[PDB]
Design a protein around this ligand. Sequence first.
Ligand SMILES: N=C(N)N1CCC(CNC(=O)[C@@H]2CCCN2C(=O)[C@H](N)Cc2ccccc2)CC1
Ligand SMILES: [Ca+2]
Length: 223
Amino acid sequence: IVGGYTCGANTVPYQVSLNSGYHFCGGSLINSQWVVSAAHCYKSGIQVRLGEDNINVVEGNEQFISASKSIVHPSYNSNTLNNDIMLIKLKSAASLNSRVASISLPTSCASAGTQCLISGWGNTKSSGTSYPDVLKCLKAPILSDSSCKSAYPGQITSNMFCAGYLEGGKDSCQGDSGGPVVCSGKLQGIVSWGSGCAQKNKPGVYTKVCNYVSWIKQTIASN
Ligand SMILES: N=C(N)N1CCC(CNC(=O)[C@@H]2CCCN2C(=O)[C@H](N)Cc2ccccc2)CC1
Ligand SMILES: [Ca+2]
């Protein structure tokens, strides 16, 4: 997260870190045994780390649970990032409490101008690299489809939306991939892609979760 702020320990209790001997992506807990992340985060050997604030210190409240299943959307296209969504099943259920909590899925799509909370342990610099210890947060609005397509001509599908800023300085970044965009208490986005990070005229692009609610529920019910 570039241009954000320190969230505060466990203030984003649905945020998870995906770990493969290092933090590599975020995700969102949607029930005690399932996480939503980005398809471009898929790999074998995922350990889901819940309850984290400082990802480099055992502070208490952490739960580390291996993934038993990762399910990339069957229509994910890695060249366009269309359908950039993946479900991760936990080997055992997380213990839910005030610091480890699920986030509701949308009942309808969000509208342009809605302010959302984006979070993660990704890069905090728009030039160069710095990765934080503690979870970072950014308040960011959903942009109009027209502004999004103007920024990324030919690249925005119906399964994507833009959020953030056009003036530069505030965005998600590498290592935030797969993490949440929460608006009015609902998981509306997944950190997916962008040109650089926090660059002028190049907002963040996010998977449009409201298009996948039925697919999520059926995939969970069948697994
Ligand atoms: N500014 C941000 N809000 N983000 C936040 C998310 C991160 C991490 N996500 C990536 O790095 C994804 C994974 C694959 C390539 N890619 C890109 O974003 C490419 N730059 C553009 C692209 C290439 C091919 C297809 C679709 C898009 C990037 C910065
Ligand atoms: Ca920790």
